[PDB]
């Protein structure tokens, strides 16, 4: 379609348009735009500084140079990446004609920086090729949300709108941290005991209006957030506060357990498509045989040349043999460790106060232990060879240590050094911790594993950083200091800066607390409305695409980490083997732990005790009786535990009291060794630990190395005074004013004291605590934003002091994200070896060539249940056709949108229509099962399960129509409505590509549910251990152990642990169990002891639950590789 095809002097432009460095001039001018949009400081209500005002005019430079370029590209002469090139320019020419809509399109310009620089043309081409096999997984999650949006829409419409306002006022009544949570005047939810308040209609609501369940778009928004396991417990505890509990738990803990399971097989989805490409290059086994010869040739040639080297430079030789016999001996394998282990205790002492003698020992030790460092080095200088010493990289590292120790000691004696710098010199020593790593035997294998992986990621990782810039430059244009709000609470992750928008994007990227962030962008524009809640779309694409890039660094490692993997006693004898005795025990275990489940557990006097004390001591009798009959018959790990739990339950009869009660919980563990499925799963995982152990031993060194740099840099900070205006020790005392809401006419008078921020960096032990929770991506923002606000030693926080200390929490967070991902790849690559170990017995063509033989050898013909009777045959001639096929598929889609609308405060004319609709859609669907049953002749109609599932829906609909209209002559009909929803599951019936993926998982449910048995056991033991211990815990609301989040009963303690298993702010629950909590005035405690029911076992408990939940959920990750392996390969 060329344009006039002319040859003036314009042909000489083509020699200049495409010369050589025309890329380089355009690379250097788009990079200026990146800086021109980074210094754009946004201003709230039409304001412009000076630099902001000069950069508006600088756009006209980048308007014309991108136009001088592009018009020459027209004079010069298909690339889709150039097709966006004129697209970016053609909006800004419209911007010269013209208000803030085109302001946001200049954010798109660095995408031109992609199209300029090649190699990132490799990445974006490769990233869309992963998206083809993922399509069925993503489309089922799209059906997963729509089912749980319609079910949460019809079950919870309008249920949140109750309030707990004051007496008659407009103020919503809270307590000091308590979120404004709904009420109900009728039963089962919130008596509203906040003393001078009465529940009235109107609006208390969830977050500000944004976490409803009415109007299809809000339901679908708040089952989205719930799916990402972030903030799913507020949407639980709000429903559970308005309806009443005991029913709506089953809604969310099946949304989590299905939302987990179908993202757990999305991560295994992408790792299918690129591995089968890589199995086709594993047949170059004769080329690694050439490779390991060459690295054997490089091994000898350096070694023999040192044989040459240390013969040339050879009285003074008499000192030499001394420096062989002292150096290479057993002595310096043990003389150095006493120094090094004595150094890493010197550098990790580090208190806040260190009374006076410790800080004198810190300086002499450093002075002493350097005198051993230099000598140790200097003995290698003479008796090893000079050229041999510096060639080794690990001893080149030891050069940089010993020099820097001398430089930092003498610079202090010089005296001319800033107090900013002596802290820097102190952090330089910390690099001595790698001296320990002269150990690890596969260290040189390990670094070659990791550094080979990064150069497979350095293409993709530069795409991730240029992804988080576009969304940071975009969010600064949409939100841009619209966080004004006329309020006093700290909306701290604002975007009104370039670094604050670079923290805040990276916070919603890692998943932590993107809920509170999205609730501010929605409330900045128009809070909740039509035009305004379409700013959800910014925090969706940032969280879906921003993770899909980051899921693609999970593959490029896994294809790189896979390339390396290619190269009378007869009477006692019967009893133990009786059916009477084994089936006795299994039934007796289940009755032993059913009482042990639900004790009181906090009454100590009531009727539920005297029953169980009789039910417990009588049960210890039988138990001990079993350990007699095993020992009269005859190493096993099951009998070492059988003799351990029985002896303690016997001594409870000698009883110290409640400890031996809880030693009876071990029982069912014995029944787990009587299960066989786990022998395959647990054994395969300890194969994988042996090869990943090397990585785990390094990633727990960094939490010690970044503890010691973390202590060093934040000692004594995070020490905040209660009213944020007093800044030091003595004067944060006395009483002050707490102004409510916003206005200075509601003064309340509280006292003030030092609050110590609970996860402080004081000790190296006490800093591994805090840096363990920012390792689990939970609670870092609150802590991170504190580390920004800190200043000098014992002083309160200054507001936005030193944002440069947000680089610590980023580099470390990114690093630990990279060592947590290299572990994960390890458990995958190991199991794909361990499954193929069964198919090493091959002598056959292929896997596809294996199944299709078993598809031919085993298969048989199909039913084909064709009828007689040409009256009936005409009826069947319709039913199996595409007439009914396309019609009954159609009327579900109209039945979808009939359920789709269903909003709140709908009109009465609309209530009359949808009541007819429901009646219309039942009569059609019951006319389906009439025609099919008169066609299929009962035999065949029950045959397929889909028709039997229709018979379940139809009757539940007919009994839903009848139950509604009998009422018109009634709250209980809320279950029968669910049957109206289940018609959407008839959709997937014809969707052949999706049904074949669910049916794979039901066929896979083989090696999974024995691993799920350990999950249930895990939740069962940690429920009962904490229930006796963390009861008496005084359900005061506002204090994070509250009426929704009890520890008291058994199913309230299961749900609390399901909160900590999906990471939902478990760091608070740990602080809720302590030493100074109240003791629930139903217990005894009768004088005085009113604030001593906390038991600090919680640090030993939630942490030991968290690793045993993390390790065992990895076994859920492994067990899904296990049976789906035929589908994933």
Element (DSSP H or E) covering residue 754: strand 754-756
String of DSSP letters for 9-56? TTHHHHHHHTSSTHHHHHHHHHHHHHHHTTS----TTS---SHHHHHH
Cis status, amide bond into 601, omega within 30 of 0: yes
Which phi and psi angles does 1105 have, rounded to 5°?
A: -75, -35
Q: Has 778 been labeled as part of a binding site? A: yes
Q: Which two tokens stand for residue 70?
A: 């592009």
- DSSP states of 352-400: SS-TTHHHHHHHHHHHHHHHHHHHHHHHHHHTT-HHHHHHSHHHHHHHH
Residues 6+ apart with CB under 8 A from 892: 983, 984, 986, 987
- Please list the alpha-helical segments (H only) found in 528-606: 538-548, 553-560, 569-576, 579-597
Indicate the helix (H) or strand (E) that contains 911. Answer: helix 908-936
| Size of the chain, expressed as the number of residues it contains | 1129
- Rounded to whole angstroms, the Cα distance separating 513 from 781 reads 8
CATH of the domain at 36: 1.20.120.350
Q: If you compute the radius of gyration of the chain from its CA atoms, what whole number of angstroms results?
A: 35
Q: Is the dihedral of CA 515, 1098, 810, 487 positive or negative?
A: positive
Place of tokens 């999305």: 266
CA 1091 – CA 619 distance, rounded (Å): 36
- Residue closest to 781 by CA, chosen among 523, 494, 1058, 1040: 494
Q: Tokens 């904490």, residue? A: 1026
C-alpha pair distances (Å), 674 with each of 374, 376, 541, 582, 638:
60, 57, 48, 11, 9
* Strand 719-721 with 747-751, pairing: unpaired
Structure tokens at 1073: 């169990």
Residues 952-977, buried b or exposed e (16+ Cβ, 10 A)? ebbebbbebbeebeeeeeeeeeeebb
Domain range for 32: 10-129
DSSP string, 564-584: GGG--HHHHHHHHT-HHHHHH
CA atoms of 1082 and 604, how far apart (whole Å): 10
In which residue are the tokens 């000790």 written?
Answer: 763
Among 252, 65, 155, 98, which residue's Cα sits nearest to residue 1055?
252
**CA-to-CA separations, 1094 to 788, 1071, 1076, 1097, 1098, in angstroms, rounded:** 32, 10, 6, 9, 9
Query: Secondary structure of 1076-1124 in the HEC alphabet?
Result: CCCCCCCCCCCCCCCCCCCCCCHHHHHHHHHHHHHHHHHHHHHHHHHHC
Beta-bridge partner residues of 756: 719
| DSSP labels, 207-263 | TTS-S-S-SHHHHHHHTHHHHTTSSHHHHHHHHHHHT-SSSTHHHHHHHHHHHHHHH
In the three-class reduction of DSSP (H, G, I as helix; E, B as strand; rest coil), residue 938 is classed as coil
Token pair for 830: 């190991």
Question: What's this structure's resolution in Å?
Answer: 3.6
Report how far apart, in Å, the C-alpha atoms of 863 and of each of 854, 872, 933, 944 are: 21, 19, 17, 11
Give the Cα separation of 571 and 568 in Å (integer).
Answer: 6
Residues in a beta bridge with 196:
none
- d(C-alpha 417, C-alpha 419), whole Å: 7
Experimental method for this entry? cryo-EM
Per DSSP bridges, beta strands 747-751 and 735-739 are antiparallel
Query: At a CB cut-off of 8 Å and minimum separation 6, what does 512 contact?
Result: 230, 777, 778, 779, 780, 781
Beta carbons within 8 Å of 468's beta carbon, 6+ residues apart: 502, 505, 506, 509, 546
CA atoms of 161 and 201, how far apart (whole Å):
6
Is 512 known as a binding-site position?
yes
- Among the listed residues 662, 619, 623, 616, the one whose alpha carbon sits nearest the alpha carbon of residue 642: 623
Contact present, 122 and 459 (Cβ < 8 Å): yes
Question: CB-based burial of residue 400 (10 Å sphere; 0-12 exposed, 13-18 middle, 19+ buried)?
Answer: exposed
> Rounded to whole angstroms, how far apart are CA atoms 238 and 849?
55
Greatest C-alpha distance within the chain: 120
In 3D, which of 593, 735, 608, 614 has the Cα closest to residue 667? 593
- For the chain, first and last CA: distance in Å? 46
* CA separation for the pair 1042, 1031 (Å, rounded): 12
The residue among 584, 598, 662, 596 whose CA lies nearest residue 626 is 584
Contact 1059, 1080 (CB under 8 A): no
């Amino acid at each position: 379609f060329c344009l006039t095809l002319q040859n003036p002097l314009r042909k000489a432009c083509i020699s200049i348009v495409e010369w050589k460095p025309f890329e380089t001039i355009i690379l250097l001018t788009i990079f200026a735009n990146c800086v021109a949009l980074a210094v754009y400081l946004p201003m709230p209500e039409d304001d412009n500084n000076s630099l902001n005002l000069g950069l508006e005019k600088l756009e006209y430079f980048f308007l014309t140079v991108f136009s001088i370029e592009a018009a020459m590209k027209i004079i010069a002469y298909r690339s889709g990446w150039n097709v966006l090139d004129f697209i970016i320019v053609f909006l800004g020419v419209f911007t010269a004609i013209l208000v803030k809509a085109l302001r946001a399109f200049r954010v798109l310009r660095p995408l031109r920086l992609v199209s300029g620089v090649p190699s990132l043309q490799v990445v974006l081409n490769s990233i869309f090729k992963a998206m083809l096999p993922l399509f069925h997984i993503a489309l089922l999650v799209l059906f997963m949300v729509i089912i749980y949006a319609i079910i949460g829409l019809e079950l919870f419409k309008g249920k949140m709108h109750k309030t707990c306002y004051y007496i008659g006022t407009d103020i919503v009544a809270t307590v000091e941290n308590e979120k404004p949570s709904p009420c109900a005047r009728t039963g089962s939810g919130r008596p509203c005991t906040i003393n001078g308040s009465e529940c009235r209609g109107g609006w208390p609501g969830p977050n500000h209006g944004i976490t409803h369940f009415d109007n299809f778009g809000f339901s679908m928004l708040t089952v989205y957030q719930c799916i990402t396991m972030e903030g799913w417990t507020d949407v639980l505890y709000w429903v559970n506060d308005a309806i009443g509990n005991e029913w709506p738990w089953i809604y969310f803990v099946t949304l989590i357990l299905l939302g987990s399971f179908f993202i757990l097989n999305l991560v295994l989805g992408v790792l299918s498509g690129e591995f089968t490409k890589e199995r086709e290059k594993a047949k170059s086994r004769g080329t690694f045989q050439k490779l390991r010869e060459k690295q054997q040739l490089e091994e000898d040639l350096r070694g023999y040349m040192s044989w040459i080297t240390q013969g040339e430079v050879m009285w003074n030789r008499v000192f030499r043999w001394k420096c062989h016999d002292l150096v290479k001996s057993r002595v310096f394998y043990w003389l150095v460790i006493l120094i090094v282990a004595l150094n890493t205790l010197s550098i990790a002492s580090e208190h806040h106060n260190q009374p006076l003698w410790l800080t004198h020992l810190q300086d002499i030790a450093n002075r002493v232990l350097l005198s051993l460092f230099t000598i140790e080095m200097l003995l290698k200088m003479y008796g090893l060879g000079l050229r041999q010493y510096f060639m080794s990289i690990f001893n080149r590292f030891d050069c940089f240590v010993v020099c820097s120790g001398i430089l930092e000691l003498l610079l202090v004696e010089s005296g001319a050094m800033t107090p900013l710098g002596i802290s820097v010199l102190r952090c330089i020593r910390l690099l001595r911790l790698f001296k320990i790593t002269k150990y690890w035997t596969s260290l040189s294998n390990l670094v070659a594993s990791l550094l080979n992986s990064i150069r497979s990621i350095a293409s993709l990782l530069l795409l991730l950083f240029l992804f988080i810039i576009i969304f940071a430059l975009l969010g600064m244009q949409l939100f841009g200091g619209r966080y004004d709000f006329e309020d006093t609470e700290v909306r701290r992750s604002n975007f009104d800066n370039f670094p604050q928008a670079l923290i805040s994007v990276f916070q919603v990227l890692t998943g932590e607390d993107w809920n509170s962030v999205m609730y501010n962008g929605i409330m900045a524009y128009g809070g909740p409305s039509y035009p305004g809640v379409l700013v959800c779309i910014y925090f969706i694409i940032l969280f879906v695409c921003g993770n899909y890039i980051l899921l693609n660094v999970f593959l490029a490692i896994a294809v790189d980490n896979l390339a390396e993997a290619e190269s009378v006693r007869v009477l006692c004898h019967r009893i133990v083997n009786a059916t009477w005795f084994t089936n006795f025990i299994l039934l007796f275990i289940l009755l032993s732990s059913a009482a042990l489940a639900a004790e009181d557990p906090i009454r100590a006097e009531s009727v539920r005790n005297q029953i169980l004390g009789y039910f417990d001591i009588a049960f210890t009798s039988v138990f001990t009786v079993e350990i007699v009959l095993k020992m009269t018959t005859y190493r096993n790990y099951f009998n070492i535990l059988d003799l351990l739990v029985v002896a303690v339950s016997l001594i409870s009869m000698g009883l110290v009291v409640k400890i031996l009660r809880v030693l009876r919980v071990l029982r069912p563990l014995r029944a787990i060794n009587r299960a066989k499925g786990l022998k395959h799963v647990v054994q395969c995982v300890f194969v994988a630990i042996r090869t990943i152990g090397n990585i785990v031993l390094v990633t727990t060194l960094l939490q010690f190395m970044f503890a010691c740099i973390g202590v060093q840099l934040f000692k004594g900070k995070f020490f905040s005074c209660n009213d944020l205006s007093k800044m030091t020790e003595e004067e944060c005392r006395g009483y002050y004013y707490v102004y409510k809401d916003g206005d200075p006419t509601q003064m309340e008078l509280r006292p003030r004291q030092w609050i110590h921020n609970d996860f402080h960096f004081d000790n190296v032990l006490s800093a591994m605590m805090s840096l363990f929770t920012v390792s689990t991506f939970e609670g870092w923002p609150q802590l991170l934003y504190r580390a920004i606000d800190s200043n000098e030693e014992d002083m309160g926080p200054v507001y936005n002091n030193r944002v440069e200390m947000a680089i610590f929490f980023i580099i470390y967070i990114i690093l630990i994200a990279f060592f947590m991902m290299n572990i994960f790849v390890g458990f995958v690559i190991v199991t794909f070896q361990e499954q193929g170990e069964t198919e090493y017995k091959n002598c056959e063509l292929d896997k596809n060539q294996r199944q299709c033989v078993q598809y031919a050898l085993k298969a048989r013909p199909l039913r084909c249940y064709i009828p007689k009777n040409p009256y009936q045959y005409q009826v069947w001639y319709v039913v199996t056709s595409s007439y009914f096929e396309y019609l009954m598929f159609a009327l579900i889609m109209l039945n979808t949108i009939c359920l789709g609308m269903q909003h709140y405060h709908q009109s009465e004319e609309m209530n009359h229509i949808s009541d007819i609709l429901n009646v219309a859609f039942t009569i059609i669907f019951t006319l389906e099962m009439i025609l099919k049953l008169l066609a299929f002749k009962a035999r065949g109609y029950f045959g397929d399960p889909w028709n039997v599932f229709d018979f379940l829906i139809v009757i539940g609909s007919i009994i839903d129509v009848i139950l509604s209209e009998i009422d018109t002559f009634r709250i209980s009909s809320a279950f029968f409505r669910l049957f109206r929803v289940m018609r959407l599951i008839k959709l997937l019936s014809r969707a052949e590509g999706v049904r074949t993926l669910l049916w794979t998982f039901i066929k896979s449910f083989q090696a999974l549910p024995y691993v799920a048995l350990l999950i249930v056991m895990l939740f069962f033991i940690y429920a009962v251990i904490g229930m006796q211990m963390f009861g008496k815990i005084a359900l005061v609301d506002g204090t994070q152990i509250n009426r929704n989040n009890n520890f008291q009963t058994f199913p309230q303690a299961v749900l609390l642990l399901f909160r900590c298993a999906t990471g939902e702010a478990w760091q608070e629950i740990l602080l809720a169990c302590s030493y100074g909590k109240l003791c629930d005035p139903e217990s005894d405690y009768a004088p005085g002891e009113e604030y001593t029911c906390g038991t600090n076992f919680a640090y030993y408990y939630f942490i030991s639950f968290y690793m045993l939940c993390a390790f065992l959920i990895i076994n859920l990750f492994v067990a899904v590789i296990m049976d789906n392996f035929d589908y994933l390969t």
